[PDB]
Amino acid sequence: QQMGRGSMSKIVKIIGREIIDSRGNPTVEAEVHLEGGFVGMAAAPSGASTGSREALELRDGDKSRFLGKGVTKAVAAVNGPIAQALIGKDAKDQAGIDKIMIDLDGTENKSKFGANAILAVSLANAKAAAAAKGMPLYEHIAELNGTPGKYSMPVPMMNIINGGEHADNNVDIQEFMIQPVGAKTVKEAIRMGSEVFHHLAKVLKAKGMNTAVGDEGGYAPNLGSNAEALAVIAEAVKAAGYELGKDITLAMDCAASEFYKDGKYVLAGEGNKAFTSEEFTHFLEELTKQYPIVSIEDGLDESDWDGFAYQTKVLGDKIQLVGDDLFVTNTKILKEGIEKGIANSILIKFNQIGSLTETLAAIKMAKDAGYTAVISHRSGETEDATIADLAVGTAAGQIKTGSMSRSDRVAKYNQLIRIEEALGEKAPYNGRKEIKGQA
Amino acid sequence: QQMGRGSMSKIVKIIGREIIDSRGNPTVEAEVHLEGGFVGMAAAPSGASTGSREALELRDGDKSRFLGKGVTKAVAAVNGPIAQALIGKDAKDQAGIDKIMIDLDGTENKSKFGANAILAVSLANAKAAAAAKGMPLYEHIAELNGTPGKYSMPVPMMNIINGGEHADNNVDIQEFMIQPVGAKTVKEAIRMGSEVFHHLAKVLKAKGMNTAVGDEGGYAPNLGSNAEALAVIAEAVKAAGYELGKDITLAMDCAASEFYKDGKYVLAGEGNKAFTSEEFTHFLEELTKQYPIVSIEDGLDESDWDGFAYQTKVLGDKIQLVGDDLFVTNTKILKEGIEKGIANSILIKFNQIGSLTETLAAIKMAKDAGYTAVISHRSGETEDATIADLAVGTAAGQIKTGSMSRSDRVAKYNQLIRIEEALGEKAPYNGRKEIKGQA
Ligand SMILES: [Mg+2]
Ligand SMILES: [Mg+2]
């Protein structure tokens, strides 16, 4: 006979604003306010403004503000037509909310309003709805995901050493990452990661090398080869008291598009040797024998589907093979990859697809096919820690959200801490069995 | 005849946990829950575990966790004795809440529980009380400070280039900062900061120098002298389209105690020249004639009070002289400095004193003497942005919260943006006139 305020979940006000990301570039933040008084606030990390296969964030291109990277247009979209089309809709109907935005932008790649406008409102909606339902976001997400009460704390792959285009060094591989698979909780995992990271700083200082950090919070020291990169990591893991293999495994992102040139893969820091697809695969395979590298991301160019079919054949039974640039969080590409035996894992970048509902759909397609889904950060992040709730609420099982420095990264580890505290063993931390290719 | 929930401001529960700061080290986070349903959550930045003049945070020293820097004991103090002494107290009585934690800790320097446990609770409490009072934190802080509805947006001093002990280079000065005094809003100031910061990266790339960032998000390139550090700042400012002097002024931190040996200041990147106090003060004077440096922090050693009395006589009319190490946010030391004409400004580190009530008293003592208070970050920060609300609610007029990268820094900038959105001209951005020594 009385209606609680929780039931007044119609949207009455949406606000957008230009805030700053962790590289100092603008991004969009939205607030969704419901009739009952509930508020959700979320921000989109940085994305791509150009590209033929993914959703595009909208940038102003005004040279007199932020070197052309203002997001006043995306923000005006949130404040004007997005808001106007969502006022009076039920925030609890996440899929209806996202559909209205998707249909109103009217393009395939969200370029009218920007994936940045649309994601920010999608997630702020979701938080506002969570609040109206009387529940934390990870619980709402699990409900929206069709998996109520089903949770896991994800195994993190933590950036530690950078190379390629992300460093002045002679390391070809773009990043090396550690995964604390022997931890029994995410809180333990985070601590092991921190300990290794601090021991690596000591290793690097003793070699006369720089310990300043890149975008993701890891080190980009002047290492002489791929081998020296892996050696300093092994040395730091041992100095922290852990055992490579059993406690900590390695993951990499080759970004192999960056060294692809005339159908060959060319590695500056191995004498400028050229490799065919296949020879590059054998090169990577040789690294997996010397070091317990269990996950390899973008190990060939996004166009090299014949080569990815080969690599997946050779390495796929024992090694997680993660499509980042391969799939760009695009389910039409993932679908076809699945049908053709291409990779066995996908990096999920929610602003590359641009709405919460579509993100859940991408994670589900992965999971139904036996692929793993790794929830990912971007280069430009914010304070916002929504990807932690996403990973728990979908039981994704893995996350890639940075080194253990910079609060753009660490706010996510902290949120995973707060989540596990509340959930305990209702969110098990499963360790190496999350990783495709293990048992 | 009906009592609203907001009147139910008694503390019913306090929760402490160990989370991770921006360098990967543990810190304390607290949540204060009130009877009416209000919750405030806050984290303490990293501080000192040792020292004889300041409040000390409490680290575990268990070498098997976080290289000895766990804060499980500080966390236990929150969950047990602090919680039990506060259940049933009125969170709106900030001074009383703080007084109970101080008296129960029972030491002069907060070493039993830790300044980390105390501050975290103190701020969580203030946020819970703000919610019970129906107001944002900046409004509540202003009421606690004795200055209801009086606000300003602070002029930021932004870390841009690091030297001394914070870099491998030949820059003796620990940091150079830019101040966008020409902006009319803190939103514009922030944008100017960004643009200068991005132009500086392009200048450093063209010179073949490293653009990876330190703790505060600025650069530590291998520059050969203090002159060169100042030249690349000048060049970046010009490439961004601003004018040194009018639009952007410079602030520095010598941390002169790092080169103070046998009563003399010994500067590596100046031939290794030795200087008396008096000569070092005339060396700084000359920099202030050659470049628009309007603020100098710790221009002499903390023990050199005769020196600081001389530097203040000479520079103090025209230059802001900021005590950091000199005062360590300790009102006993500040009062004595004020009586002896020592410096004209103070860096406020709220975790160095350890409570919100004493932080307000520090700022008041500075302002009543005509000193300026610059609200400060620490080297290990979190996502928490309370220092932004603090600066606005005390009308401090200046803030030192980092470069324009890393969300540990940029979260504060974002919060200043949200505050100025809501307040507009009720929070004037006063520019150059906030700075001690300007007309
Ligand atoms: Mg990649
Ligand atoms: Mg200093």
| A109 belongs to a structural domain | yes
Ligand nearest to the Cα of A174, by number: 1
Range(s) of the domain holding residue B61: 10-134
Residues A46 and A195 occupy one common structural domain:
no
Residues A125 and A270 occupy one common structural domain:
no
> Rounded distance, CA A246 to CA A238, Å?
12
Residue A232 host element (H or E): helix A226-239
Residue B183's SS3 state is: coil
Cβ partners under 8 Å of residue A2, min gap 6:
none
For A359, list phi and psi in degrees, rounded to 5: -55, -50
Give the nearest partner residue to A406 out of B195, B210, B406, using CB atoms. B406
Cβ atoms B419, B389 nearer than 8 A? yes
> Rounded distance, CA B390 to CA B115, Å?
18
Q: How many CB atoms lie within 10 A of CB A310?
A: 19
How far are the Cα atoms of A21, A385, B37, B45, B435 from residue B183, in angstroms, in the given order?
Answer: 20, 31, 41, 29, 14
**A and B: number of Cβ contacts within 8 A:** 125
Cβ partners under 8 Å of residue B219, min gap 6:
B160, B161, B162, B200, B201, B204, B209, B210, B211, B212, B213
> Rounded distance, CA B387 to CA A185, Å?
32
> Rounded distance, CA B2 to CA B6, Å?
11
DSSP labels, A367-433: HHTT-EEEEE--SS--S--HHHHHHHHTT-EEEE---S-SHHHHHHHHHHHHHHHHHGGGS-B-GGG
Say if residue A245 is exposed, middle or buried (CB neighbours under 10 Å; 0-12, 13-18, 19+): middle
Domain boundary among B134, B157, B184: B134
Ligand nearest to the Cα of A302, by number: 1
- Tell me the nearest-neighbour CA distance from A407 into chain B, angstroms: 5
CATH code: domain of residue A311: 3.20.20.120
- The 3-class secondary structure across B70-137, one letter per residue, is CCHHHHHHHHHHHHHHHCCCECCCHHHHHHHHHHHHCCCCCCCCCHHHHHHHHHHHHHHHHHHCCCCH
CA dihedral A238, A242, A248, A250 (to 10 degrees): 0
| B287 belongs to a structural domain | yes
Residue A438's SS3 state is: coil
> Rounded distance, CA B200 to CA B162, Å?
13
How far are the Cα atoms of B79, B104, B128, B384 from residue B9, in angstroms, in the given order?
Answer: 19, 22, 8, 23
Residues B283 and B393 occupy one common structural domain:
yes
Residues A145 and A112 occupy one common structural domain:
no
Residues B128 and B238 occupy one common structural domain:
no
Name the token pair of A263: 């159908």
Cβ atoms A155, A431 nearer than 8 A? yes
Classify residue A272 as left (phi > 0), alpha (psi -120 to 50) or beta.
Answer: left
- Tell me the nearest-neighbour CA distance from A21 into chain B, angstroms: 7
Domain boundary among A107, A134, A161: A134
| A4 belongs to a structural domain | no
DSSP labels, A260-306: EETTEEEEGGGTTEEE-HHHHHHHHHHHHHHS-EEEEES-S-TT-HH
| B432 belongs to a structural domain | yes
What letters, b where the CB count within 10 A reaches 16 and e where it falls short, cover B62-94? Answer: eeebbbebbbbbbbbbbbebbbebbeeebbbbb
Letter for the amino acid at B100?
Answer: I
Best probe of the B interface among A405, A419, A423, by most B CBs < 10 A, is A405
| B1 belongs to a structural domain | no
Residues A222 and A322 occupy one common structural domain:
yes
> Rounded distance, CA A112 to CA A105, Å?
6
Helix, strand and coil content of chain A, in percent to the nearest 5, comes to 45, 20, 40
How far are the Cα atoms of A31, A48, A89, A186, B265 from residue A27, in angstroms, in the given order?
Answer: 14, 12, 25, 29, 45
**Resolution rounded to one decimal, in angstroms:** 2.2
Q: Which residue shows structure tokens 């203002």?
A: A70
Name the token pair of B356: 């919100």
What is the DSSP pairing of strand A175-179 with strand A158-162?
Answer: antiparallel
Q: Do B212 and A194 touch (CB under 8 A)?
A: no
> Rounded distance, CA B70 to CA B60, Å?
5
CATH code: domain of residue A88: 3.30.390.10
Length of chain B: 439
Residues A130 and A149 occupy one common structural domain:
no
| B326 belongs to a structural domain | yes
**Is B67 near chain A, with CB under 8 Å?**
yes
Cβ atoms A171, A250 nearer than 8 A? no
Residues A190 and A72 occupy one common structural domain:
no
Give chain B's domain count.
Answer: 2
Cβ partners under 8 Å of residue A132, min gap 6:
A5, A6, A7, A8, A9, A34, A36, A38, A91, A92
| A3 belongs to a structural domain | no
List residues of A with catalytic annotation. Answer: 216, 349
Helix ranges, B372-428 (H): 386-393, 407-423
Cβ atoms A183, A201 nearer than 8 A? no
> Rounded distance, CA A191 to CA B166, Å?
25
Residue B306 labeled ligand binder: no
Cβ atoms A156, A177 nearer than 8 A? no
- How far apart are the CA of B253 and the centre of ligand 2, in A? 6
| A2 belongs to a structural domain | no
- Of B337, B389, B413, nearest to B185 (Cα)? B413
Domain boundary among B134, B160, B190: B134
Residues B20 and B97 occupy one common structural domain:
yes
Residues B114 and B216 occupy one common structural domain:
no
Residues A394 and A270 occupy one common structural domain:
yes
Say if residue B262 is exposed, middle or buried (CB neighbours under 10 Å; 0-12, 13-18, 19+): exposed
Name the token pair of B364: 């008041």
- Of B154, B78, B82, B229, nearest to B388 (Cα)? B154
Residue B209's SS3 state is: coil
Residues A112 and A217 occupy one common structural domain:
no
Q: Which residues in chain B are contacts of A381 at CB distance < 8 A?
A: 407
- Of B120, B34, B126, nearest to B79 (Cα)? B120
